Ligand binder design. Sequence first.
Ligand code: HEM
Ligand code: CA
Ligand code: CA
Ligand code: MG
Ligand code: MG
Length: 326
Amino acid sequence: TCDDGRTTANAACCILFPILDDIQENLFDGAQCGEEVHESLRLTFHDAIGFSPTLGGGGADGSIIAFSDIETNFPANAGIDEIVEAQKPFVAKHNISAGDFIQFAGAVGVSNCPGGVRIPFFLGRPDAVAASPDHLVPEPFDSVTSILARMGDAGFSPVEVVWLLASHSIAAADKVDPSIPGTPFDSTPGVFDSQFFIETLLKGRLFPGTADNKGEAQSPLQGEIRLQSDELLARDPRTACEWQSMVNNQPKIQNRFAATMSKMALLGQDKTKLIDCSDVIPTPPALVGAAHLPAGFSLKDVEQACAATPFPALTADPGPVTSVPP
Ligand code: HEM
Ligand SMILES: [Ca+2]
Ligand SMILES: [Ca+2]
Ligand SMILES: [Mg+2]
Ligand SMILES: [Mg+2]
């Protein structure tokens, strides 16, 4: 404990500080909650969800890097191969497995985010053994049942799915509508805030680029894109309530995202042959901005889809509602 004099609870985890320091400088652009962080977060999902107790797949096993030429040609993995190519030199350079690195980079990346949380992290996943099977990654044009069943088959309850999707608060899309790459799922792609759950709950006005790409629904806001799957999920009897539940109190968004991610990172892996290295993850900057309806239009535009509970709705800020920049 440890070399720099930096510090953790179990010693096999000091291997992670050169990795951490390297990541922050050269992967994440001096550590910032931007594209490389978003794509790193997305990669933890596309690697780990590659798991089915019956259909096969090693889960959180680094397979999407180890067998990149195979998995990155899965149609559902469109746009992933660039972050794979981004991380490979760091995997090559260092002495942790591909699986560990993918999940480590995701954790670190989130902690960079304003409003972020620190996902627990474990060390010791073996090299991948085999490519994930195709057709295990939920696609944005899939039905709510299909998606709830895929995630469920991997072990998540429909409510765990809404929690994980808080990820989309720090998230954009390059491939859904190619003519508008880097267009986010909410107004604040740099901030881990509830804006995503709110803005997906507004009426859909327009298509931010070319109309009706597969998997795309109409957006409420120019400069923001909406997935068909987030739209359905927000309004479906099965997930509508918990979806609304997530409207401003970053607390539950932070608690639940942290713990379900921790759960996602262990798919196909076994926690008690791993060491806790969660202490290594950096402290995240506090939330800037309040969760607001994007002004201009009212609760007139919130499609309540939960009967049991009404809106948890703070009012909006002044006059118009302004741009959100891709
Ligand atoms: C459950 C069904 C899900 C569907 C249908 C879905 C769909 C998508 C799609 C279509 C994109 C845009 C990719 C692109 O065109 O550039 C995206 C981005 C993203 N996803 Fe999801 N996703 C799901 C779940 C998740 C989960 C569980 C996570 C947890 C980590 C996650 C994290 C992210 C992140 C961080 C991005 C940002 C990509 C970027 O900024 O480049 N998603 N998702
Ligand atoms: Ca995998
Ligand atoms: Ca956000
Ligand atoms: Mg599908
Ligand atoms: Mg991207």
